[PDB]
Amino acid sequence: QVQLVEASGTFFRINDMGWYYCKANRNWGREWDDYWG
Amino acid sequence: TARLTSFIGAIAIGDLVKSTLGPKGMDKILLSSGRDASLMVTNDGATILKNIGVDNPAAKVLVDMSRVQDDEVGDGTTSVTVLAAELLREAESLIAKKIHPQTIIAGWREATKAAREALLSSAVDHGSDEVKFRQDLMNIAGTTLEAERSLHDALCVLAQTVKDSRTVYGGGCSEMLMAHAVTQLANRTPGKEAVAMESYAKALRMLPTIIADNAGYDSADLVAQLRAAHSEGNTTAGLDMREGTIGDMAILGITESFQVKRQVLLSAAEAAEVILRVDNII
Amino acid sequence: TARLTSFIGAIAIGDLVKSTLGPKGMDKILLSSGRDASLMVTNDGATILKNIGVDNPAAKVLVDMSRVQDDEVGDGTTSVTVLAAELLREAESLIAKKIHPQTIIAGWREATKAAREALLSSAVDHGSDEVKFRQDLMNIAGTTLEAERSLHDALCVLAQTVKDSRTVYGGGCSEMLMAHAVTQLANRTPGKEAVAMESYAKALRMLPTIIADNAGYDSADLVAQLRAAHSEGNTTAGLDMREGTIGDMAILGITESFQVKRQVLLSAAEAAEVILRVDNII
Amino acid sequence: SRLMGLEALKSHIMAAKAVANTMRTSLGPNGLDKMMVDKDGDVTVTNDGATILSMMDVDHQIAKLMVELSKSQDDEIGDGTTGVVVLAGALLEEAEQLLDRGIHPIRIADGYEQAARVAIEHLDKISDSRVVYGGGAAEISCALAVSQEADKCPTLEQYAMRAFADALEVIPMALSENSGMNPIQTMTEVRARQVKEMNPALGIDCLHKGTNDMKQQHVIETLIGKKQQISLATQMVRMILKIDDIRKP
Amino acid sequence: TDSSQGIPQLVSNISACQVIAEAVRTTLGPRGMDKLIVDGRGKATISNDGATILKLLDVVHPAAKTLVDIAKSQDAEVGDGTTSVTLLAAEFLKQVKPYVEEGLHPQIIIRAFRTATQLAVNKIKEIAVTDSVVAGGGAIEMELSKYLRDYSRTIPGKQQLLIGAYAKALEIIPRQLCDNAGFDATNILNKLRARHAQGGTWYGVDINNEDIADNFEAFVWEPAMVRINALTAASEAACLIVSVDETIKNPR
Amino acid sequence: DKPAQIRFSNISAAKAVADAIRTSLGPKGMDKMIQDGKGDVTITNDGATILKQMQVLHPAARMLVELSKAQDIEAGDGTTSVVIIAGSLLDSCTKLLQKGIHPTIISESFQKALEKGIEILTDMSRPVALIAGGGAPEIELALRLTEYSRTLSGMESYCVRAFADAMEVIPSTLAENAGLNPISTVTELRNRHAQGEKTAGINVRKGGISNILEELVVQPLLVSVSALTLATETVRSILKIDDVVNT
Amino acid sequence: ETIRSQNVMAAASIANIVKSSLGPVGLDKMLVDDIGDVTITNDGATILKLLEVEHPAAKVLCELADLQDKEVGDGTTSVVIIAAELLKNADELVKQKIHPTSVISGYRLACKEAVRYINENLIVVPGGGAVEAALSIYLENYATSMGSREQLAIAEFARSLLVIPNTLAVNAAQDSTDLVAKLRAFHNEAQVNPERKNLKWIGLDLSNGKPRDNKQAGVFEPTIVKVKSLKFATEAAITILRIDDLIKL
Ligand SMILES: Nc1ncnc2c1ncn2[C@@H]1O[C@H](COP(=O)(O)OP(=O)(O)O)[C@@H](O)[C@H]1O
Ligand SMILES: Nc1ncnc2c1ncn2[C@@H]1O[C@H](COP(=O)(O)OP(=O)(O)O)[C@@H](O)[C@H]1O
Ligand SMILES: Nc1ncnc2c1ncn2[C@@H]1O[C@H](COP(=O)(O)OP(=O)(O)O)[C@@H](O)[C@H]1O
Ligand SMILES: Nc1ncnc2c1ncn2[C@@H]1O[C@H](COP(=O)(O)OP(=O)(O)O)[C@@H](O)[C@H]1O
Ligand SMILES: Nc1ncnc2c1ncn2[C@@H]1O[C@H](COP(=O)(O)OP(=O)(O)O)[C@@H](O)[C@H]1O
Ligand SMILES: Nc1ncnc2c1ncn2[C@@H]1O[C@H](COP(=O)(O)OP(=O)(O)O)[C@@H](O)[C@H]1O
Ligand SMILES: [Mg+2]
Ligand SMILES: [Mg+2]
Ligand SMILES: [Mg+2]
Ligand SMILES: [Mg+2]
Ligand SMILES: [Mg+2]
Ligand SMILES: [Mg+2]
Numbered sequence A: 001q002v003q004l005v006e007a008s009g010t011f012f013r014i015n016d017m018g019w020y021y022c023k024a025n026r027n028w029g030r031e032w033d034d035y036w037g
Numbered sequence B, C: 001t002a003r004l005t006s007f008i009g010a011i012a013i014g015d016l017v018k019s020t021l022g023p024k025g026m027d028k029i030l031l032s033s034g035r036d037a038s039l040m041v042t043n044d045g046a047t048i049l050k051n052i053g054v055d056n057p058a059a060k061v062l063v064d065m066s067r068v069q070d071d072e073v074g075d076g077t078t079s080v081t082v083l084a085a086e087l088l089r090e091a092e093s094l095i096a097k098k099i100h101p102q103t104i105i106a107g108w109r110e111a112t113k114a115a116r117e118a119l120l121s122s123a124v125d126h127g128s129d130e131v132k133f134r135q136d137l138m139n140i141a142g143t144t145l146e147a148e149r150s151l152h153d154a155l156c157v158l159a160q161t162v163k164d165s166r167t168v169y170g171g172g173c174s175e176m177l178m179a180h181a182v183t184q185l186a187n188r189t190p191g192k193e194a195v196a197m198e199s200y201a202k203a204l205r206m207l208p209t210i211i212a213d214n215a216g217y218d219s220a221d222l223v224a225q226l227r228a229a230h231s232e233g234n235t236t237a238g239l240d241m242r243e244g245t246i247g248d249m250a251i252l253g254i255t256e257s258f259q260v261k262r263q264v265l266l267s268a269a270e271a272a273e274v275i276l277r278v279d280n281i282i
Numbered sequence D: 001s002r003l004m005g006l007e008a009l010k011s012h013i014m015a016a017k018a019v020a021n022t023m024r025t026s027l028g029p030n031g032l033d034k035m036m037v038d039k040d041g042d043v044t045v046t047n048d049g050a051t052i053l054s055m056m057d058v059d060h061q062i063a064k065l066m067v068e069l070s071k072s073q074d075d076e077i078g079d080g081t082t083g084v085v086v087l088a089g090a091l092l093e094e095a096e097q098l099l100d101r102g103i104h105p106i107r108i109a110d111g112y113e114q115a116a117r118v119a120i121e122h123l124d125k126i127s128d129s130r131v132v133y134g135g136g137a138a139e140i141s142c143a144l145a146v147s148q149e150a151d152k153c154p155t156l157e158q159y160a161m162r163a164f165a166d167a168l169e170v171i172p173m174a175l176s177e178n179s180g181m182n183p184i185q186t187m188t189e190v191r192a193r194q195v196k197e198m199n200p201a202l203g204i205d206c207l208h209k210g211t212n213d214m215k216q217q218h219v220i221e222t223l224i225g226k227k228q229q230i231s232l233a234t235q236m237v238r239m240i241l242k243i244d245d246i247r248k249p
Numbered sequence E: 001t002d003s004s005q006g007i008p009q010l011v012s013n014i015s016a017c018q019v020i021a022e023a024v025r026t027t028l029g030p031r032g033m034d035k036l037i038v039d040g041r042g043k044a045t046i047s048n049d050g051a052t053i054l055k056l057l058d059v060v061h062p063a064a065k066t067l068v069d070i071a072k073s074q075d076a077e078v079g080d081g082t083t084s085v086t087l088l089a090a091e092f093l094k095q096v097k098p099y100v101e102e103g104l105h106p107q108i109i110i111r112a113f114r115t116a117t118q119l120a121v122n123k124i125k126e127i128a129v130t131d132s133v134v135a136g137g138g139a140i141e142m143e144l145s146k147y148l149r150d151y152s153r154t155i156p157g158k159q160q161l162l163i164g165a166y167a168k169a170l171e172i173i174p175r176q177l178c179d180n181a182g183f184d185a186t187n188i189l190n191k192l193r194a195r196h197a198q199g200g201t202w203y204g205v206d207i208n209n210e211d212i213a214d215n216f217e218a219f220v221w222e223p224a225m226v227r228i229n230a231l232t233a234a235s236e237a238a239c240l241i242v243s244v245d246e247t248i249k250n251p252r
Numbered sequence F: 001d002k003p004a005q006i007r008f009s010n011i012s013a014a015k016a017v018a019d020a021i022r023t024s025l026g027p028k029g030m031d032k033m034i035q036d037g038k039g040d041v042t043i044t045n046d047g048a049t050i051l052k053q054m055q056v057l058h059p060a061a062r063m064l065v066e067l068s069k070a071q072d073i074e075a076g077d078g079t080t081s082v083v084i085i086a087g088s089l090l091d092s093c094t095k096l097l098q099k100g101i102h103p104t105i106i107s108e109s110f111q112k113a114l115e116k117g118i119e120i121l122t123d124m125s126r127p128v129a130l131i132a133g134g135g136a137p138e139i140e141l142a143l144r145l146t147e148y149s150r151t152l153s154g155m156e157s158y159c160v161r162a163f164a165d166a167m168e169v170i171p172s173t174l175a176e177n178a179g180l181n182p183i184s185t186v187t188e189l190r191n192r193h194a195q196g197e198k199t200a201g202i203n204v205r206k207g208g209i210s211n212i213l214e215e216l217v218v219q220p221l222l223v224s225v226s227a228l229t230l231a232t233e234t235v236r237s238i239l240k241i242d243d244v245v246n247t
Numbered sequence G: 001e002t003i004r005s006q007n008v009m010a011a012a013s014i015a016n017i018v019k020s021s022l023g024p025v026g027l028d029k030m031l032v033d034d035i036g037d038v039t040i041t042n043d044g045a046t047i048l049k050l051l052e053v054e055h056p057a058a059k060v061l062c063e064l065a066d067l068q069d070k071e072v073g074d075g076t077t078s079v080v081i082i083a084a085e086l087l088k089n090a091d092e093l094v095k096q097k098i099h100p101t102s103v104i105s106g107y108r109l110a111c112k113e114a115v116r117y118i119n120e121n122l123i124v125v126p127g128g129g130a131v132e133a134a135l136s137i138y139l140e141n142y143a144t145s146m147g148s149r150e151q152l153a154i155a156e157f158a159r160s161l162l163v164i165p166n167t168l169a170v171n172a173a174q175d176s177t178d179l180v181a182k183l184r185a186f187h188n189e190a191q192v193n194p195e196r197k198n199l200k201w202i203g204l205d206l207s208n209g210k211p212r213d214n215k216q217a218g219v220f221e222p223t224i225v226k227v228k229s230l231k232f233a234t235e236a237a238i239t240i241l242r243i244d245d246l247i248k249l
Helices: B008-013 B057-071 B079-096 B101-119 B130-142 B147-163 B175-184 B194-204 B207-214 B219-229 B258-276 C008-013 C057-071 C079-096 C101-119 C131-141 C146-165 C174-186 C194-204 C206-213 C219-229 C259-278 D011-016 D018-023 D049-055 D063-070 D081-101 D103-127 D137-149 D157-168 D183-194 D229-240 E007-022 E062-076 E084-095 E104-112 E116-127 E144-152 E160-167 E173-181 E185-198 E223-243 F046-050 F061-075 F082-097 F111-120 F134-146 F156-167 F170-177 F182-194 F221-239 G004-022 G044-050 G055-071 G076-095 G102-113 G130-144 G175-184 G223-241
Strands: A018-021 A021-023 B167-169 B255-257 B277-279 C028-031 C165-170 C253-258 D033-036 D043-045 D131-133 D218-223 D243-247 E034-038 E043-044 E132-134 E203-204 E212-214 E221-224 F030-034 F041-042 F130-132 F219-220 G241-249
Touching: A018 B079, A021 E007, B008 B057, B008 B079, B057 B219, B057 F182, B079 B101, B079 B194, B079 B207, B079 B258, B101 B194, B101 B258, B101 E160, B130 B147, B130 B167, B130 B255, B147 B255, B147 B258, B167 B175, B167 B258, B167 D137, B167 E034, B167 F182, B175 B194, B175 B207, B175 B219, B194 B207, B207 B219, B255 B258, B258 E104, B277 F041, C008 C057, C008 C079, C057 C079, C057 C259, C057 F030, C079 C101, C079 C194, C079 C206, C079 C259, C079 D137, C101 C259, C131 C146, C131 C165, C131 C253, C146 C253, C165 C174, C165 C259, C174 C194, C174 C206, C174 C219, C194 C206, C206 C219, C219 E223, C253 C259, D011 D063, D011 D081, D011 D229, D011 E185, D018 D049, D018 D081, D033 D049, D043 D049, D049 D063, D049 G130, D063 D081, D063 D229, D063 E043, D081 D103, D081 D229, D081 E173, D081 F030, D103 D137, D103 D157, D103 D229, D131 F061, D131 F221, D137 D157, D157 F182, D183 F156, D229 E185, E007 E062, E007 E084, E007 E116, E007 G004, E043 F082, E062 E084, E084 E173, E104 E223, E116 E144, E116 E223, E132 E223, E144 E160, E144 E185, E160 G175, E173 E185, E173 E203, E185 E203, E185 E212, E185 G130, E185 G223, E221 E223, F030 F046, F041 G055, F046 F061, F046 F170, F061 F082, F061 F221, F082 F156, F082 F170, F111 F134, F111 F156, F111 F221, F134 F156, F134 F182, F170 F182, F219 F221, G004 G044, G004 G076, G004 G223, G044 G055, G044 G076, G055 G076, G055 G223, G076 G102, G076 G223, G102 G130, G102 G223, G223 G241
Parallel strands: B277 D033, D243 E034, F030 G241
Antiparallel strands: A018 A021, B167 B255, C165 C253, D033 D043, D131 D218, E034 E043, E132 E221, E203 E212, F030 F041, F130 F219
16 A cells, blocks of 8 residues: 555555654545554 | 527517506507407506417416416516516626626525515514504505406405515615615625626616606606615605606505515516526427 | 717727737737738737728727827827727617717716716825835836837826826726716716716726736626725725736836826717717718 | 448537537536426426436437436436536547547547546545545546556557546536636636645535535545446447447438 | 449449448457447447348348348358458459459459469368368458469469459458558558568457467467358359349339 | 637638648658749749748738748748747647637747746757757657646646647658658657657658667757747737738 | 649650550651641650640659650650559559658669669660569569568559550550560569579560560660669659649749
């Protein structure tokens, strides 16, 4: 789905980018989309 | 596509029912049959609609909406046909100036809202004090009068008046007042909906113009005098159809039942809209 | 009799000089000769009048009145031709509605009085404080710019500005303001002279309509936004001919010399009247 | 055999462009109605299908083919049957200018097939409930997708991939029309916004509510109710774009 | 049209057969343009098969009628190859019109569609491979053409430019196979001819991609017997329409 | 009324002075017999003279003929590609006008594209500077402007795309005159440009596309930049022209 | 119709005018003057310097024919015939979407690979119809072993070179198809069979109706006449092909 390097994949958008691990909310985030490092 | 086939039929059904509008309205003679050759002369405006053969399909939406105003109200059958046809005659102009029929409708909706909100504030509920109520009913019965036919019409109007005791003046006071309030609104709306509300107002001022064009008076002058009287605070002026001037419609005893006038406005605007949002006739 | 032979010539001389009105005005190409075949493209509005062969006799009263505005003022040669032709285009309508050409004139006289009395109150005399005066002159020189021809025009306008330091905004502010004041007058005059002042106003609102129709914008919408801004107290709105919206003509630095605008109005109304009171061409 | 060939696909397209141009003025909520008038009837309806399509248009046996194929959309996949006639009309109207260049109809059909594969391959990226957000916004997120992949095709299909992009933007151009808006200006001013800020939910506000963001206006389209429009229209073009003759004894 | 007797009648029959083939040509191939033929009941029939178009078509011309009967006869017993037969027949007729406008005479054109056709079925029965199969999608009409012209070069007499026109009239099956897919025939056919000159007796038009492809390896196969029957039926239809001199329409 | 017929009596009199010079473009350019009024007929394949002696008589036709003169006094050898450009830009303006957008928007969006075109034809360039001729400076224009018309808003990103699509005419005529299939080779050229190759273009001697620049003619920028500039100037001048008035 | 077929028809007309007076035995023509002074003559070398040709294509053909005549005073009536036959076949080619340039490249290749094989027929050239009927087969074999967009313009340069043997046999009352095809059946077993390599001198006989060996019968023709004729007919066909429009002033 989403490969993240510390981002790429089947994404049309990047809503928020944070550091936890690097977190990126890819699509409209309904808690279904959640990608970390 | 029918931007004319569905508009000239409407303005024709409301172009032959006019000239019978005011008190001194012309007549029409109904050559009906070919063998039982019958001549009946009609100063009425509803008989010329329940009798003629409607050929155009858009015209049906007016001829079958006048029955509503006639069998569910009584008086106000030639004013919701003529108002609808002079709304659909200014529509034709706006749609020829490349304005979309879906902005004219959105404009006329706010226009009829500001108009219904305008003759409501000017209604007088004299039904409380029954010494004037007796008087008012006589004015509303005189502004409504084959004999028993007209009498039944007057009875329906009077019944609606006793139910809703609010009364608004007639002869041009109500139409000119609503047109003034619609122009006062169209002077404050930014967008193409202002050319539609000004057009709505120009259509409302066509009822007194036709009431004067039927008594020989100088309508282009009396209607301007009304528009000025109704634009400098005075709100009770109106055609004095006894000497061809403008008179106080309160001291002259020319009143109409608020329900009849509001339903005339509503049915006219609704029919004009229903015939507006029609491209093709299948 | 000439109610058309002496009106369509005028609206034609002012129907080919338009579309070159605003900043982003179209051009015209003058095929002049047959042997010395010459092609000159003109974004100007005065060259298309001092060059064309005027055939209609009524048209002469416009083509020889534009020279006045061009050799005695400088700027304001396409706006007193287009204003006169859209006054004589609404005249044709009023004279087709059976209104006499001697009431249209009496109406337009009070209309131009109430208009000249309207951009006079809105003029700003910043010529006193010469720190803005230096700025104003730059705006008036930018709203006025073959090179030395346009430069001489700008010089005449600037000279008239230093003589009469009153400046009124442009792009539509002045025309829309005068039209608002004329409508505010036409809503208070009883008589057939009101249908003439409303027509005068509709003719004044045709200059910003043509300035927008030349830049591709939605004139039927921008002009309505202007009429609403100028009708709810704001008095400095106007076409912002850089992004197709309405902007404050004060913070945008689009001003015009009050003398040029008032003389445009006066010459336009005077020519329209001089071509109105003409029945026959001998 | 009268009028057969590449001059029979300018008549078949003039025929399937009439049943579409009538249905082009009824898409949005602000869809202008039509009057049903036959030997007996005065119905005023703006909906689709039997209410509009299959009570008219007996001509060229191809309008009868559009109305014959649109029965598959309604009764069967919700009620989205006006968007498939308008989309088919747009695809054929672009094929009209693709044929003038000299592209064999089969090639245009393969191009539309590839572009529909790309579009349906892009709609399923925007399932947000099962659901693709947008009144006029789903057809602008795909037109942007099949325009990029167009230039990655080296054959003549590339032209068809671009015509499919240019025709997918007709749904959010009859939504701009049928209202008091300008079709091109409004369609583009929201197409340039799905790029330069990634939000495929931005679409035409047919209702003048004010926000050009169909995510909050809550105007939605069921996904299988859009995977059909993009498919049933292409499967309708590829049946009208490939028949070469109408013989009538 | 004259259509009186001799050259005029033959040209008329040839034009009628051209029309009846042109009404089916685009249907040839796996993916071919459909046809919307409507009967007298208002039914819309979309069918991309030459058999079901000739059985639903009004044949009111005699030569066209005979061609359509031979095509239906091929469709009845064999099945496959009812539009390739009429295509080959009308092409054989089209490519001898320029020679029948002179006084070449049909009796001689008939002793060119029977020697050449016998030789071509011999070549098929000699080159077929195993039930016996030959590579379709062209790759035969592009080989039988190369063989027939290379053999006609060794014929002293009038049959040289008639077999050489019989051969050239076989290139239509590998032509409209790619003209229906829209593949710029004058290039794929040039490649096929160049590739059949050197070698490649099974190289024919490919439909998945605009290029020649060895059709035997690609398993696009055609039964040798079916090809022989189609060739013989097409040649016999040609000879029939070439052997017709007048149309004796009974007055009543 | 008159505007919408004098923007289509010029765009149909300039688009008929381009489809009389079009198939004379390139090394393998078809000749064109020229029938003089006396009667003798001469044969030339250069568009300069055909325009020189043509008896155009139309305002826009003359505007386009005086464009060849300006182009050969400014760059020397562009005298039939600039006319083809400024006739296909007007072809595109014929469809952009039926849509209903105003000529003062297809005149401020061409200069919005020409200024980007200037910055596309100065990146291909090999700084000596020279640009890879043959069709590259136009397929690259089409591709890059179509990519750039997707970042533009309003009526702007509808005429810039028409600019790009009208650039694909000189490659089409060069491919036709070279005996190729124009549409197929133009699509292959665009697919070869998107993949990075900027030197591509119709090699007319071989008879097909080529990347090696040794036998791929290279031209100065001045000719291509001048062609774009003068063609955009001329189409802007023709679009903003209505009402041919006789004085 | 286009103005390329008109040029082809003009060249064909002047051909048909000259082509019945080709061989040693050939009928005459009468050239009516302005006053009416008639000159009856064969030997088209004069029929081309006296014919009233007004069409531009016929004019260019006459100019190149006279250029050839003054270069070498022989083979000027065969240049016109070969050129008009090249033009006929090139028009038939162009009328099936073969650009005139591909046909011109094909004619260049053929005229360049024909004089590089006439130098395998030279000793002088056998003459009669030998070189033509030999180049026919050689070029029909060389075309297929190339496979380019111009592989069809060399096989219409090989079947259009046998217009000389095909009009040298109607001007001898023998035949058109039979005699030329016996000629093109002897030259086949001179490029297929290596033993019978001396069958490449077998031209045709204009006295009897049967092809004979034009080396054992002394009917030679100088090589620089046949080469010049093929090289001028090719340039004539090319010059009339590269025009595609007539500009009216
Ligand atoms: N005496 C009167 N003076 C002035 N106006 C009148 C008088 N009587 C009727 N009217 C006006 O004439 C209009 C037409 O009414 P009428 O024709 O009687 O019935 P309907 O309302 O059905 O047309 C009404 O709007 C009313 O205001
Ligand atoms: N930059 C600008 N922005 C808005 N309006 C302008 C601008 N420049 C000129 N105008 C308007 O264009 C109108 C036409 O002026 P112009 O054609 O330049 O000379 P003339 O006044 O002789 O027609 C003027 O009324 C002016 O208000
Ligand atoms: N409130 C709305 N705002 C914007 N677009 C809408 C709205 N409601 C529906 N649409 C759009 O209208 C189109 C559907 O047209 P419709 O009349 O429903 O056709 P059908 O007859 O096929 O149901 C779709 O593109 C849909 O996205
Ligand atoms: N997959 C394929 N690839 C290439 N050619 C094919 C293919 N399938 C069929 N063909 C060719 O198409 C021709 C026509 O066959 P078709 O029209 O399908 O049936 P029929 O042989 O009855 O006409 C045949 O000669 C065959 O060689
Ligand atoms: N060797 C070549 N290969 C490909 N294209 C060429 C070649 N030489 C010139 N061109 C093209 O020809 C066009 C120049 O026009 P041209 O026909 O040379 O004008 P003129 O008619 O004055 O000769 C340009 O598009 C250029 O790319
Ligand atoms: N005696 C002959 N027998 C056979 N062929 C001949 C004879 N004389 C001439 N020919 C052929 O006729 C052809 C045409 O020659 P002709 O038209 O008479 O003069 P030109 O050489 O000027 O064309 C020549 O190519 C030649 O080979
Ligand atoms: Mg009443
Ligand atoms: Mg100025
Ligand atoms: Mg729906
Ligand atoms: Mg089969
Ligand atoms: Mg050059
Ligand atoms: Mg000789």
